[PDB]
Amino acid sequence: SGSGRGRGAIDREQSAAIREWARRNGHNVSTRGRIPADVIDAYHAATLEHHHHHH
Numbered sequence: 806s807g808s809g810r811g812r813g814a815i816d817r818e819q820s821a822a823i824r825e826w827a828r829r830n831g832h833n834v835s836t837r838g839r840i841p842a843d844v845i846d847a848y849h850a851a852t853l854e855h856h857h858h859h860h
Contacts, residue, residue, distance in 0.1 A: 820839075832844060
């Protein structure tokens, strides 16, 4: 009874958003588990620099 692990929610759940972003950009990424830090950095560059070092 009550709330618990049966909800299926993840703590670092932005992994799925980085996987989707990598798929939308045609970049190599795994279907499940961890993502390479180079692709996490690639995602951070896209979210930070596109309104700083782009026109």
